[PDB]
Design an enzyme around this catalytic site. Structure first.
Site, PDB file in Angstrom:
ATOM      1  N   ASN A 150       6.334  -2.623   0.101  1.00  0.00           N
ATOM      2  CA  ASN A 150       4.893  -2.603  -0.150  1.00  0.00           C
ATOM      3  C   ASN A 150       4.171  -2.807   1.173  1.00  0.00           C
ATOM      4  O   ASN A 150       3.554  -3.847   1.408  1.00  0.00           O
ATOM      5  CB  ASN A 150       4.512  -3.687  -1.154  1.00  0.00           C
ATOM      6  CG  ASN A 150       3.094  -3.548  -1.661  1.00  0.00           C
ATOM      7  OD1 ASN A 150       2.383  -2.602  -1.324  1.00  0.00           O
ATOM      8  ND2 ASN A 150       2.666  -4.511  -2.464  1.00  0.00           N
ATOM      9  N   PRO A 151       4.193  -1.809   2.047  1.00  0.00           N
ATOM     10  CA  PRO A 151       3.821  -2.022   3.448  1.00  0.00           C
ATOM     11  C   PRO A 151       2.311  -2.111   3.632  1.00  0.00           C
ATOM     12  O   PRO A 151       1.532  -1.990   2.693  1.00  0.00           O
ATOM     13  CB  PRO A 151       4.373  -0.777   4.132  1.00  0.00           C
ATOM     14  CG  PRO A 151       4.237   0.265   3.091  1.00  0.00           C
ATOM     15  CD  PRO A 151       4.519  -0.399   1.782  1.00  0.00           C
ATOM     16  N   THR A 178       0.825  -1.201   0.000  1.00  0.00           N
ATOM     17  CA  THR A 178       0.000   0.000   0.000  1.00  0.00           C
ATOM     18  C   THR A 178       0.860   1.252   0.000  1.00  0.00           C
ATOM     19  O   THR A 178       1.651   1.471   0.913  1.00  0.00           O
ATOM     20  CB  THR A 178      -0.938   0.040   1.214  1.00  0.00           C
ATOM     21  OG1 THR A 178      -1.812  -1.095   1.183  1.00  0.00           O
ATOM     22  CG2 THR A 178      -1.766   1.313   1.206  1.00  0.00           C
ATOM     23  N   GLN A 179       0.702   2.076  -1.033  1.00  0.00           N
ATOM     24  CA  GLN A 179       1.434   3.329  -1.132  1.00  0.00           C
ATOM     25  C   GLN A 179       0.611   4.537  -0.717  1.00  0.00           C
ATOM     26  O   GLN A 179       1.184   5.536  -0.272  1.00  0.00           O
ATOM     27  CB  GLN A 179       1.935   3.534  -2.563  1.00  0.00           C
ATOM     28  CG  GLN A 179       2.937   2.489  -3.013  1.00  0.00           C
ATOM     29  CD  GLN A 179       4.188   2.485  -2.164  1.00  0.00           C
ATOM     30  OE1 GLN A 179       4.428   1.553  -1.399  1.00  0.00           O
ATOM     31  NE2 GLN A 179       4.991   3.534  -2.286  1.00  0.00           N
TER      32      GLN A 179
END
Lengths: 238, 204, 239, 240, 228, 250, 201, 213, 215
Positions: free
Chosen positions: I104-105, I1-2
């Site tokens: 891609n946290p 999640t960006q």
């Protein structure tokens, strides 16, 4: 005899003989006895020697701080399942930061040994694992088989002439709950001495004892600190 | 640009029963020539040539990949290749490198392998074919070459005046260009023979 | 993908396929080779030309480098894969460590290649046995041999092919250092030894030497007539 | 003979003996029965004590696939734990993809296709297991299914697996099934196990009972076994 | 006459690995003795022809600077195991800055002693003796193609392995010295071989805590024969 | 799974091969071909095995497969086993030209095929090729060349050759009537008509049953010639005239 | 950081400083920059400390296996070739490595120079580091091929001293090794503050 | 965007004694301008003779600690013994280099006894280089602690100063004084000072408070 | 999640004598827009542990799906074991660290409150794999606002009763309603005891606006 070749081929009677041959490979190894109290779990093994100058082949091996296993049968299948055994213990130690309970670890072993007992070109694992350890609810004694039927037992013995070893257990299984370690251990090695010829028993070169306890990490003794346990014994009658 | 790295010019022109094709001779790197004998027109069978212009890497690369597929085609079949068949072959080979494209713009000229019927076409760098009836041009000095052929080409022309028209089209357009020059070679082919001439151009 | 073992154990404790392919080496032509102190020599026998056909394509003596020379037995096609493999490895060794390849190094490459070619699954073994002769840096001439099991093995004189033990028995009573004194006597030694081979009428004997400072030089078919002449002259002094 | 080796070869009359051999391998195991009332499903498994052989509570053949789905396996034992791992895995993907509880009709079909898949190739053997599937839902009712080693899967009101199969189902149809509540059936299932298996074969046997239904709020769990103890008391009234 | 490579016996043992132990019997003999002062070791070369160069046939092969080896059986199958055992000691030192112990070498060797199969070949055909000196003093181990790993005080294997082990139990005790064990070994060697003992038939290898390497150049060999 | 394998990889208990010898005996039946060079030019002799009168013969090309601008081949064995090899060997010669922009020498093209034919005999249990074939070609290093091929991956240089079992007796004729560099290209052609007269048991040597293809060196073209059916007939009538001339001494 | 190496009649002399910094901050004063590979080979350190420490340790792994297989010590040109091929696989990924390889060979002395940019050159004199350019001038003024052992010690000792005196990042102590035919030998390890009182008078 | 790194703070000190090793650290875990907690020690008892300290990014500190604890057990089940002090430092250098192109942001100091009962201190860097020193200080306040121990422990830049070996009790008050002066000028230096003392008889811990600002 | 689309806000938590109380509000925001006025941000894990979270809400439904499955997986074994609140805190830390290592946290910040074996547990989990334990936790602007109120009482009096802790959270949730721009006057309070997990309803605060008359 022609249907007694592969693991895949069923019998016309309905008994896959390759597993039945692997049960015979367990009966060739040396005997060992495991048992438990309410608060302790002790397994005692018997070693053999290839020659006089050769050292005795070790039986008990440490896995984790509460789980330790015994062995019977082959030695390749010993270390191959041992490397899988040590791997799974430190994984949940790495992920969940807790030791594995003993029961669901053994369910991973029956899933592990299932696949080479069904697909082609794969032998079963000839192995005789006796398993002792603590979960959060006390001691446990488990046994396995090459057919992967793990048994939650209280005292068993597997290997060569364990027929006589089992008979001593049920006539003293009621005593195996209230007694503490000093006679719990020497209850167990009174069972090994009928799996022997009548002229040698335990002379500080062929016996090893592993104990797991409440305030006790799984500790293996061998031939020098076993000598305090080997005193206070009666000889075999005749 | 990448097309203007080495430069060049290829022109083809359709006549009455014959077809003519011409190119320059200069090989250089952006200001500095190296030689005057860089081949840009390659024979693909008899009475059928092909010309290449643009980046000199893809000139020598595509002309060998096309020759690779051509000899396999003329041995599986017994016949020679038709000019429409070659145009579909080249358009396949450029479209395979859709996103890593070759930096070249081919020009095909040739006759019918059955009759005297000529054929000209040119393609994009990604492989869109385009057939005409008078002339096709390619290279850096494109706009000078359109100004010639729109003012000099006639429909039905003997092989003599076809040679004189494509000569004056090249010598006036390439001398207006800076990075192209150093001699012009002209192929004029017909049903019975192949004539190759080199023109006297400004060597500056 | 072929997951099937070819070579397994026998109840008496042996392999089938290794001692099963050595007979194919025994059905090949003979080729012997000795070493001196300065000039090595090796000679194939049983040319058996069709007397109207080509001969530069049936060459049984080739070279991996400018130091190392080949001679083999067995079947023809299996040698071609081993030779063209070993030409790559000896040349890629120079792309690494800049020395010329020692003759002991290239024999370990061939024997290890031929061993895993029996250890693996679904793979026939090779059916050849090579002679590897080279005179490396420091100029010490030596020779090796191979086996379809893949055992590199250093000798001082070798005999393979159809009739190997008979020629080896001829060299068994021929341990003289005086024959390794003169170079032409050592060439006449091999020509006398190859005369004990099948018919050997001066035409089926293709010998080749190497003077340790030069590529392999095949003797012309006039010195073969000349050396067989002096061998007949030396045999005439038996009275 | 000559045609019974692989599971990929047909007999010259039109069947496969490798499936036929594994069916009667299930027959040699002990008796496990199942039955459903109008608002629940009751499981019952006879378990044999050999001499001592285990701490009581070991290796119970009443598994637990989902919160509302239960097993009752018989035949070979180790492959039954494999099918339990398949069925737990299948119900999780239905939960993850579709967001609600798995219907028992689909869960029978997904497993039976997986059992079918090992009857076509020479590389693997057919399973030597057979089992039951019980569930309950307020939008569906109580359903009871049954899977052979060949892969045939459909429904029952009652069924029996083991040595005593035909002799054990003769008295199942003697009962009423529609009007019964399952708490009455819990002490009924005790006597069918207790009537069959005389101690001439094996002297020691032991009874498990699993139980899902409307009283258990759809969740599957074991009976209160040591609690209320009306299984063995009401079963041993069959003395004459 | 073609059964499985991966099939248990009807009696219950195995099929092919039982034949692997039989393949050791056709190899040359070897004797290694662990002493409290060091580890001596011996082997017979079995020379076939005088045309054959003698030093090209080796049985003692170094693994590390303080670990020797001894082989009997198929030659180039052992050469696979030697090359791996050399590498896996170098992985140990260039990740820990310490020497891999003599027992823990053979643990890595005997892992793929039984890993033959189709996915993921045949079992190997050589038996090994590993001597060496480490922190627990000098050690001596013995393995087999069946992966059964064990420590021996003085093990002798090969073609004459039975009569060697019987005669060795007569002459061995715990308080041996080094040179006493060396000349006692070759007495057993000349009883079990058929040729005359000379500078070419045998070779030794002696590792010590003091003399940290095994170092047995020739004509030291003739020094011991003239003293016996 | 294991009992259905054919084991076409194990040696024979004699200590030799077992499957390749079965394959090499199929080449002797169903086909007879040869080729002869001694000077500038080289010929190839073919034979129609099926000569039925309802075929089209509209290929206008045959067993002579022109695989290059300088080389061609004559194949005998399993028919469409060759079509795998002819399409493969045609592309090996062409990927060489892409790499160097120079025509392929005739020697190392044969080595490229013989490594493929061996690779099925080495490992796998794949059925080997039942195909033997010939080679003709011109190069910059030796000129005109002949090569025999084998199913085993073995080859060799030749100047007069043989394929068919009927042509085993032709080898006895080719030892008797061969020369050393006197190949005028009528003496080589009248010899080839003389060989196929005695060997092929079809009487009188009908012109439709045989086929001759030659390769001559032009200035730089290397003209590959498939000669038509009219000049076959006058060559047969030439050979029939020489037989009637030579019998006058008897 | 300043190293130098030169060969002459009696072998090879290798000298280096001992200061490793971090920006404007000095990490330590006692860094052993001359990495000892074998009893017969020596390597240096240049730029990335962990890059030079890792790959030369990995280079020693291959040289030991080469000796066990071939029963012979590796040559000096061989080890420089193996190191150049390993570093080339990570070209453009940002490795800092400009080391030198020293040792005795069968062809005599051996001196090579390996960069992280694929450079592999032989030669007679070299100087690597941020203060390397201060070492070229004083050494080439005093270099000869025919020098003595005590003369070659004092040339390389002052040459490091003149570099650390001018440069800011170089300093600490002066290590000095001598590569001979039998093998290398440590000569001395001198402090810069002690040399300052020596070359003052 | 998502930046994967952040600074947390902490300060680690180690002193190699003659027969002992002292490892000290603070307990503040901060981020930005805020305080997460005041109880977060950086000491980790690896063996009975080895204590490691980890500073820098705290998410990598928790990961790198659990990797080493697994490989200690993997050593013991494979070699029937425990690792030495120098063997752990040699193992850690390959682990730090194994993520060369996505590095940890962790400063490491390993202290403890050798195989002769002497103090050994190994300092590290976030890429893998290491050396053996007598005393190092790592973390945020590393620049305020290195030159003072050069004067006291190193005995540098003093005329006619003798070289007495540092005793145990003198080393204790040297540690307790430098963190008082570090807490005055650094904002990352916290409240509780966990001090671990590794002797030949066990590991002793001790906590000393500092100012709470 | 960006890019977090629908976000939560501050979550509070504090220990007391024999239990942990955790409160958060019921608002999902899309930028400045208060789009979803009625959502739940607290998941009741099985009997002794409990989870609340901030950050992106779509990632929170993902972890609600995964953790919900793992609890069912052990209950179907029935061996008499369960996950401790520390083991879930240990599991969730490795989930975050492995996720951020692939660049891609998961845009969250999670608070775990648990009570097992007579021990109150309160754990923190960051997006960047930062995790610790504390007697009082606060996320977002609550770490700037409510966290000085939590530490002031706890450093004065270390232990608290249940009624003292429950009233003190309602005071901090009142302050966050004033000074946070993206808060909402509807929150729910969840509390673990030895009796289990209990979640209260949509409670609200009582504001004071008497200073509005002061110009």
């Amino acid at each position: 005899n022609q249907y007694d070749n592969d693991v895949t081929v069923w019998s016309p009677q309905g008994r896959i003989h390759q597993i039945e041959y692997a049960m015979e490979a367990v009966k060739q190894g040396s005997a060992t006895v495991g048992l438990k109290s309410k608060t302790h779990a002790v397994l005692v093994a018997l070693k053999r020697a290839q020659s006089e100058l050769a050292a005795h082949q070790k039986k008990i091996l440490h896995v984790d701080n509460h789980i330790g296993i015994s062995i019977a049968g082959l030695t390749a299948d010993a270390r191959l399942l041992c490397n899988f055994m040590r791997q799974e213990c430190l994984d949940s130690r790495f992920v969940f930061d807790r030791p594995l309970p003993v029961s669901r670890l053994v369910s991973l072993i029956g899933s592990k040994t299932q696949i080479p007992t069904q697909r082609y070109g794969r032998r079963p694992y000839g192995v005789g694992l006796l398993i002792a350890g603590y979960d959060d609810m006390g001691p446990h004694i488990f046994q396995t088989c090459p057919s992967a039927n793990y048994f939650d037992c209280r005292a068993m013995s597997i290997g060569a002439r364990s027929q006589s070893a089992r008979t001593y257990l049920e006539r003293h299984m009621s005593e195996f709950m209230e007694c503490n370690l000093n006679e719990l251990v020497k209850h167990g090695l009174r069972a090994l001495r009928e799996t022997l010829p009548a002229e040698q028993d335990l002379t500080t070169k062929n016996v090893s004892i592993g104990i797991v306890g409440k305030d006790l990490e799984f500790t293996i003794y061998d031939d020098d600190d076993v000598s305090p346990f080997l005193e206070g014994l009666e000889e075999r009658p005749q | 640009s990448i097309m203007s790295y080495n430069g060049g010019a290829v022109m083809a022109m359709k006549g009455k029963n014959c077809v003519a094709i011409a190119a320059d001779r200069r090989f250089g790197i952006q200001a500095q020539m190296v030689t005057t004998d860089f081949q840009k027109i390659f024979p693909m069978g008899d009475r059928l040539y092909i010309g290449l212009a643009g980046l000199a890497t893809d000139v020598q690369t595509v002309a060998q990949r096309l020759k690779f597929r051509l000899n396999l085609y003329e041995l599986k079949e017994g016949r020679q290749i038709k000019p429409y068949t070659l145009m579909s072959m080249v358009a396949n080979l450029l479209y395979e490198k859709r996103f890593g494209p070759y930096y070249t713009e081919p020009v095909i000229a040739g006759l019918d392998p059955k009759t005297f019927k000529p054929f000209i076409c040119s393609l994009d760098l990604i492989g869109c074919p385009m057939v005409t009836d008078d002339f096709v041009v390619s290279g850096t000095c494109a706009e000078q070459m359109y100004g010639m052929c729109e003012s000099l080409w006639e429909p039905n022309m003997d092989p003599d005046h076809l040679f004189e028209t494509i000569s004056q089209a090249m010598l006036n357009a390439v001398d207006r260009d800076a990075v192209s020059g150093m001699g012009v070679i002209v192929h004029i082919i017909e049903k019975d023979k192949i004539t190759t001439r080199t023109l006297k151009a400004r060597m500056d | 993908s072929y997951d099937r073992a070819i070579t397994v154990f026998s109840p008496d404790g042996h392999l089938f396929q290794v001692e099963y392919a050595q007979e194919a080496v025994k059905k090949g032509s003979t080729a012997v080779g000795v070493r001196g102190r300065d000039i090595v020599v090796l000679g194939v026998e049983k040319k058996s030309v069709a007397k109207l056909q080509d001969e530069r394509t049936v060459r049984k003596i080739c070279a991996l480098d400018d130091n190392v020379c080949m001679a083999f037995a067995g079947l023809t096609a299996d040698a071609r894969i081993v030779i063209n493999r070993a030409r790559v490895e000896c040349q890629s060794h120079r792309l690494t460590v800049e020395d010329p390849v020692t003759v002991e190094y290239i024999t370990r490459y061939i024997a290890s290649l031929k061993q895993r070619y029996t250890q693996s699954n679904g793979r026939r073994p090779f059916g050849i046995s090579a002679l590897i002769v080279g005179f490396d840096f420091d100029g010490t001439p030596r020779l090796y041999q191979t086996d379809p099991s893949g055992t590199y093995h250093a000798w001082k004189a070798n005999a393979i092919g159809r009739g190997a033990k008979s020629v080896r028995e001829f060299l068994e009573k021929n341990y003289t250092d005086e024959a390794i004194e003169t170079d032409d006597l050592t060439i006449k030694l091999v020509i006398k030894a190859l005369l004990e081979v099948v018919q050997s009428g001066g035409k089926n004997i293709e010998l080749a030497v190497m003077r340790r400072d030069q590529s392999l030089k095949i003797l012309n078919p006039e010195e073969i007539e000349k050396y067989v002449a002096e061998i007949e002259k030396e045999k005439e002094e038996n009275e | 003979t000559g045609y019974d080796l692989s599971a990929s070869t047909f007999s010259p009359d039109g069947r496969v003996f490798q499936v036929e051999y594994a069916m009667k391998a299930v027959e040699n195991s002990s008796t496990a029965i199942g039955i459903r009332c109008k608002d629940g499903v009751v499981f019952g498994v006879e378990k044999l004590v050999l001499s001592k052989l285990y701490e009581e509570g070991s290796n119970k053949r009443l598994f637990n696939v989902d919160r509302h789905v239960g097993m009752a396996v018989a035949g070979l034992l180790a492959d039954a734990r494999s099918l339990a791992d398949i069925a737990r895995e299948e119900a999780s993907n239905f939960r993850s993809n579709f967001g609600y509880n798995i219907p028992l009709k689909h869960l029978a079909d997904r497993v039976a296709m997986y059992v079918h898949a090992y009857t076509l190739y020479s590389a693997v053997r057919p399973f030597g297991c057979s089992f039951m599937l019980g569930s309950y839902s307020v939008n569906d009712g109580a359903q009871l299914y049954m899977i052979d080693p060949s892969g045939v899967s459909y429904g029952y009101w009652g069924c029996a697996i083991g040595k005593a199969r035909q002799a054990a189902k003769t008295e199942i149809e003697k009962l009423q099934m529609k009007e019964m509540t399952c708490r009455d059936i819990v002490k009924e299932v005790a006597k069918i196990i207790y009537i069959v298996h005389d101690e001439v074969k094996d002297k020691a046997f032991e009874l498990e009972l699993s139980w899902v239904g409307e009283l258990t709020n759809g969740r599957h769990e074991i009976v209160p076994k040591d609690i209320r103890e009306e299984a063995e008391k009401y079963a041993k009234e069959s003395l004459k | 006459y073609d059964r499985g490579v991966n099939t248990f016996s009807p009696e219950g043992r195995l099929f092919q690995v039982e034949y692997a132990i039989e393949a050791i019997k056709l190899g040359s003999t070897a004797i290694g003795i662990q002493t409290s002062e060091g580890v001596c070791l011996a082997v017979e070369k079995r020379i076939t022809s005088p045309l054959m160069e003698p030093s090209s046939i080796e049985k003692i092969v170094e693994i590390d600077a303080h670990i020797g080896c001894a082989m009997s059986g198929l030659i180039a199958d052992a050469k696979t195991l030697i090359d791996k055992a050399r590498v896996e000691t170098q992985n140990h030192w260039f990740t820990y800055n310490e020497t891999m112990t003599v027992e823990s070498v053979t643990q890595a060797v005997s892992n793929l002693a039984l890993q033959f199969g189709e996915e993921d070949s045949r079992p190997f055909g050589v038996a090994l003796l590993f001597g060496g000196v480490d922190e627990k003093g000098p050690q001596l181990f013995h393995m087999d193609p069946s992966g059964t790993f064990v420590q021996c005080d003085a093990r002798a294997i090969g073609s004459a392995s039975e009569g060697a082990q019987s005669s060795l139990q007569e002459v061995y005790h715990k308080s041996m010295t080094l040179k006493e064990a060396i000349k006692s070994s070759l007495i057993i060697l000349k009883q079990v071989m058929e040729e005359k003992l000379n500078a070419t038939n045998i070779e030794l290898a002696t590792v010590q805590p003091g003399q940290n390497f095994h170092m047995f150049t020739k004509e030291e060999l003739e020094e011991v024969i003239k003293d016996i | 799974s294991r009992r259905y394998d054919s084991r076409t990889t194990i040696f024979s208990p004699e200590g030799r091969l077992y499957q390749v010898e079965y394959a090499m005996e199929a080449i002797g039946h169903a086909g007879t071909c040869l080729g002869i060079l001694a000077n500038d030019g080289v010929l190839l002799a073919a034979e129609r095995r099926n000569i039925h009168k309802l075929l089209d013969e509209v290929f206008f090309s045959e067993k002579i497969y022109k695989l290059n601008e300088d080389m061609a081949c004559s194949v005998a064995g399993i028919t469409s086993d060759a079509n795998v090899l002819t399409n493969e060997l045609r592309l090996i010669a062409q990927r060489y030209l892409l790499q160097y922009q120079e025509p392929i020498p005739c020697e190392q093209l044969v080595t490229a095929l013989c490594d493929i034919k061996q690779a099925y005999t080495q490992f796998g249990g794949k059925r080997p090729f039942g195909v033997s074939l010939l080679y003709i070609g011109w190069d910059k290093h030796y000129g005109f060349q002949l090569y025999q091929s084998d199913p085993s991956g073995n080859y060799g240089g030749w100047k007069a050759t043989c394929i068919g079992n009927n042509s085993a007796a032709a080898v006895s004729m080719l030892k008797q009537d061969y020369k050393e560099g006197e190949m005028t290209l009528k003496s080589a052609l009248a010899l080839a008509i003389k060989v196929l007269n005695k060997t092929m048991d079809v009487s009188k040597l009908s012109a439709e049953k045989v086929e001759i293809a030659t390769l001559t060196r032009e200035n730089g073209k290397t003209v590959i010639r498939v000669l038509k059916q009219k000049e076959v007939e006058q060559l047969i009538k030439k050979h029939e005239e020489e037989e009637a001339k030579a019998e006058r001494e008897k | 950081t300043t190293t130098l190496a030169f060969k002459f009649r009696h072998g090879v002399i290798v000298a280096a400083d001992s200061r490793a910094t971090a920006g404007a901050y000095i990490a330590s004063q006692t860094v052993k920059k001359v990495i000892e590979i074998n009893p017969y080979l020596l390597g240096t350190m240049a730029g990335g400390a962990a890059d030079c420490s890792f790959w030369e340790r990995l280079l020693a792994r291959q040289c030991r296996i080469y000796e066990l297989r071939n029963k012979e010590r590796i040559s000096v040109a061989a080890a420089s070739k193996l190191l150049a091929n390993m570093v080339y696989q990570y070209k453009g990924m940002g490795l800092s490595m400009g080391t030198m390889i020293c040792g005795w060979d069968k062809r005599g002395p051996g001196l090579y120079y390996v960069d992280s940019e694929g450079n592999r050159i032989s030669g007679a004199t070299f100087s690597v580091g941020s203060g390397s350019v201060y070492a070229y001038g004083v050494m080439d003024r005093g270099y000869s091929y025919d020098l003595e052992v005590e003369q070659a010690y004092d040339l390389a000792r002052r040459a490091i001293y003149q570099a650390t005196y001018r440069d800011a990042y170089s300093g600490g102590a002066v290590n000095l090794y001598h590569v001979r035919e039998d093998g290398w030998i440590r000569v001395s390890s001198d402090n810069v503050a002690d040399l300052h009182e020596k070359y003052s008078g | 965007r998502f930046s994967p790194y952040v600074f947390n703070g902490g300060t680690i000190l180690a002193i190699a004694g003659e027969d002992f090793a002292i490892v000290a650290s603070d307990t503040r875990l901060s981020e930005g301008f805020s305080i997460h907690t005041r109880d977060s020690p950086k000491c980790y008892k690896l063996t009975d003779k080895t204590v490691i300290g980890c500073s820098g990014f705290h998410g990598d500190c928790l990961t790198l600690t659990k990797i080493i604890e697994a490989r200690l057990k993997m050593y013991k089940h494979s070699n029937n013994k425990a690792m030495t002090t120098g063997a752990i430092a040699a193992m850690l250098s390959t682990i730090l280099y194994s993520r060369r192109f996505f590095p940890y942001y962790v400063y490491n100091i390993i202290g403890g006894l050798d195989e002769e009962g002497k103090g050994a201190v190994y300092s590290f860097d976030p890429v893998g280089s290491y050396q053996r020193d007598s005393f190092k200080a790592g973390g945020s306040a590393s620049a305020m602690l290195q030159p003072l121990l050069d004067n006291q422990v190193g005995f540098k830049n003093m005329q006619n100063v003798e070289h007495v070996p540092l005793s145990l009790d003198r080393a204790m008050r040297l540690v307790k004084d430098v963190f008082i002066s570090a807490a005055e000028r650094d904002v990352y230096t916290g409240d509780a000072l966990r001090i671990c003392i590794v002797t030949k008889e066990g590991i002793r811990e001790e906590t000393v408070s500092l100012r709470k600002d | 999640t960006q890019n977090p689309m629908v976000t939560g806000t501050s979550v509070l938590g504090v220990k007391f004598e024999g239990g942990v109380v955790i409160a958060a509000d019921m608002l999902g925001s899309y930028g400045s827009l208060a789009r979803f006025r009625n959502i739940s941000r607290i998941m009741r894990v099985n009997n002794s542990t409990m989870l609340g979270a901030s950050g992106d809400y779509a990632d929170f439904q993902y972890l609600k799906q995964v953790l919900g499955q793992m609890v069912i997986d052990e209950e179907l074994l029935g061996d008499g074991h369960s996950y401790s609140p520390r083991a879930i805190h240990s599991w969730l830390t490795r989930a975050m660290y492995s996720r951020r290592s692939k660049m891609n946290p998961l845009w969250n910040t999670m608070v775990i409150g648990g009570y097992a074996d007579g021990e109150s547990f309160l754990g923190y989990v960051d997006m960047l794999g930062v995790a610790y334990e504390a007697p009082s936790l606060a996320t977002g602007y609550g770490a700037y606002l409510a966290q000085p109120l939590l530490r002031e009482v706890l450093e004065k009096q270390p232990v608290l009763s249940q009624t003292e802790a429950r009233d003190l959270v309602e005071r901090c949730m009142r302050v966050l309603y004033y000074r946070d721009a993206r808060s909402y006057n509807r929150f729910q309070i969840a509390t673990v005891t030895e009796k289990g997990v209990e979640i209260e309803g949509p409670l609200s605060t009582e504001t004071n606006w008497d200073i509005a008359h002061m110009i």
